[PDB]
From a paper:
In archaea and fungi, DAROPP is reduced at the phosphoribosyl moiety by RIB7 yielding 2, 5-diamino-6-ribitylamino-4(3H)-pyrimidinone 5′-phosphate (DARIPP), which is then deaminated into 5-amino-6-ribitylamino-2,4 (1H,3H)-pyrimidinedione 5′-phosphate (ARIPP) by RIB2. ScRIB7 exists as a stable homodimer, and each subunit consists of nine central β-sheets flanked by five helices, resembling the structure of RIB7 homologues.
The structure of ScRIB7 was solved using single-wavelength anomalous dispersion (SAD). The crystals belong to space group P212121, with one asymmetric unit containing two ScRIB7 molecules. The most likely dimeric interface was calculated using PISA, and the two molecules per asymmetric unit were modeled in the appropriate positions calculated by PISA. ScRIB7 has a unique α1 compared to MjRIB7, while EcRibD and BsRibG have N-terminal deaminase domain. Electronic density of loops Lα2′-β3 and Lβ1–α2 in ScRIB7 are missing probably due to their flexibility.
Numbering used by the authors:
A (entry chain B): 8 to 47, 57 to 75, 98 to 243
B (entry chain A): 8 to 47, 57 to 92, 98 to 242
Write the structure that this text describes.
Amino acid sequence: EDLPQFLQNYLPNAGQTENTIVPFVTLTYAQSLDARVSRGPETKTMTHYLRHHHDGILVNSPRPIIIDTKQKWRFDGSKMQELFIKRQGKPPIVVVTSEPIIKEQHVDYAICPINDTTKLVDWKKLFEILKEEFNIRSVMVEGGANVINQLLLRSDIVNSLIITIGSTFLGSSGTEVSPPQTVNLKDMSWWKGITDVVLCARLAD
Amino acid sequence: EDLPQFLQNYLPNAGQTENTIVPFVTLTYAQSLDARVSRGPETKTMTHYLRHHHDGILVGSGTVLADNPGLNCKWGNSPRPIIIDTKQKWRFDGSKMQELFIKRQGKPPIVVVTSEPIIKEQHVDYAICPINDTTKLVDWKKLFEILKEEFNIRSVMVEGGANVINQLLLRSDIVNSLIITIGSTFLGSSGTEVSPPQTVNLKDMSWWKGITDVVLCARLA
């Protein structure tokens, strides 16, 4: 709508990550008034517009990037697998902590060593691996509220934050997005729709 | 500024002509992106403009006990403060509210209790509201009726208590307008959140946008 002009300054910017080893990282999600992303229109256009401006998407057409540290996901027999077959959808990059004994066709494996301290995955190292090993110049992370909750803390990684808020309450039992500490924003910009609003911003510090 | 017309349809006297037994009730609060109201300049003025249009301003005790709020109005007379204090632990004597009352800058409070007031304070009015036999908590419908019938409160703005908000969000038979400000900040998951226990659908929504904040006006579906 007027949405492309609104998003423009927050889209991956070529000359900004070029001659760096990190990709542009956008953090994006859709929540209710009570900050829930699940429970216990018009956003299609925007999401698909955003996706086609990124090389990878962490959950032309973007490549799917899946975290599967515990190694239990499978490509064969996935929506993704079928989409790949019909010439409209790329095969996934699968993020793991060690080399899997059994690998699937078309699937790329990114071995990211779990962080020494946090005991979680080293987000900085993972994003460099995606960029350097797999030509992923930009990445749109869409969810796992737990992924979002960690990355909200990473002002040194995240480049743009794009949040849709719908005019509804999902209820307290729904899965929330809220960082463990306070997170300040900068360079904020709001767009308003009929029933929804979108925030574009950056992470302070 | 466009804020007055934006709010116009959601204020008590856009409510047209009919006399009612229930006061007009606006549910209004300010939250972070993570729906938090407590820690873990345009909106402040709006709040005051809103206060100017209501006979009463309601808060749960706890929010009065935490922040020591004036709860009076400045131009965007003043509304009467209404404190829910079922435990009868809030004290008017020595409060900021009392300071404003003495300086003729604010009104004395109405205190809502659920049994005989034990220590009545000078210039304080007490509203004894029945307890709902199902919830064990105060009967919101009867309370608002009493505020109107006994204390001549024709309209009330409830601002405070996540706990209060969380209950009223479920009461489409009580709430006339929902007005929510959302700031562009995260307070963090330790902060106290506003989220009702069940899904709540909204209707008649209209959004307003500032530079750092957005405001939603809606009604309960």
